[PDB]
Design a protein around this ligand. Structure first.
Ligand code: A1A7Y
Length: 318
């Protein structure tokens, strides 16, 4: 492992929160060379590279919106990868584009559920709402299987305000929707969120606070705006987190379901650094995947730096 050379492009915001500069010094003591890539230079000038770990989703977004600077950056990384199929990429770019779009990620999940054909997994119905359409909006939502209450989220799952959401309970509360957005059926789950952090083959299930239970169907409740990251941070104390009482099924996630679901995501995308947000439907007992996260923060995850080396050492053994 000594002499192996790894490069990385991360946002100093990913970097700081992962404490990535400390992890780079961790690897240099193991015998590695860890280089912070300059995407001003051609990347061949910084080679050779055995592993490239990155999260360029925010360059990827700009490049799709015809930003000259960002398409230039994406080009040079892609043409470096074609000229170097030996360099390991964590993670491939087609997986980045999929996970930054909530509509694409939610559709990917529903297809993987049909793949496993296991009655323990389910996805809440969803649809992309590019615009509201008058006094009759719900009939458009009813044809995609959506009922009150549902959650409005941003349709791009990265950047500022991408965690700002709103839960709508009745016809009066449709003005809370701000399109274009993604709407998703709200699932009662006894205010427990199981965040599954995946680093290659090893994974960690972290239990987090979540939204409390509400009445199924239509309620006389005003729409509630919240921040999903703030609500489910390793500890929030919110009016939305305080559960009233246990209602319906309250079981703990099946370890077999998490493992088989993690494999199906790594096979479908080639992704190896990601997180799965899972809630337990208190109303059928099924595992409900509500969001996918590309290379997340791994906030306070036990033994993350150790699992990250073992992953980097694992991919280099092939
Ligand atoms: N469909 C859904 N049902 C319930 N909760 C959901 C959800 N989608 C996202 N969440 C978040 C969990 C943490 C806070 C809100």
């Amino acid at each position: 492992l000594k002499g192996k050379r790894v490069g990385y492009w991360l946002s100093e915001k990913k970097i700081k929160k992962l404490n990535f500069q400390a992890f780079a010094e961790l690897c240099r003591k193991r015998g590695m060379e860890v280089v912070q890539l300059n995407l001003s230079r051609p990347i061949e000038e910084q080679g050779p590279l055995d592993v490239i770990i990155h999260k360029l989703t925010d360059v990827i977004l700009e490049a799709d919106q015809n930003d000259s600077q960002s398409l230039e950056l994406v080009h040079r990384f892609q043409e470096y990868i074609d000229a170097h199929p030996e360099t390991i990429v964590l993670d491939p770019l087609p997986a980045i584009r999929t996970l930054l779009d909530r509509s694409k990620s939610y559709e990917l999940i529903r297809k993987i559920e049909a793949y496993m054909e296991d009655d323990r997994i389910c996805s809440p119905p969803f649809m992309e709402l590019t615009s509201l359409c008058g006094d009759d909006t719900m009939r458009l939502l009813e044809k995609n299987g959506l009922t009150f209450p549902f959650i409005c989220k941003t349709r791009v799952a990265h950047g500022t305000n991408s965690h700002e959401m709103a839960i709508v309970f009745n016809q009066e509360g449709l003005n809370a929707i701000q399109p274009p957005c993604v709407v998703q059926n709200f699932i009662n789950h006894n205010a427990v969120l199981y965040k599954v952090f995946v680093v290659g083959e090893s994974y960690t299930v972290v239990q987090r606070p979540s939204l409390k239970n509400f009445s199924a169907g239509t309620s006389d409740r005003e729409s509630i705006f919240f921040n999903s990251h703030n609500v489910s941070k390793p500890e929030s104390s919110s009016v939305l987190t305080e559960l009233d009482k246990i209602e319906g099924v309250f079981e703990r996630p099946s370890d077999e379901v998490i493992r088989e679901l993690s494999r199906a995501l790594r096979q479908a995308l080639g992704v190896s650094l990601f997180g799965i947000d899972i809630i337990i439907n208190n109303q059928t007992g099924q595992h409900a995947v509500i969001d996918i996260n590309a290379f997340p923060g791994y906030e306070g995850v036990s033994e993350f730096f150790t699992d990250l080396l073992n992953h980097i050492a694992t991919v280099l053994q092939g």
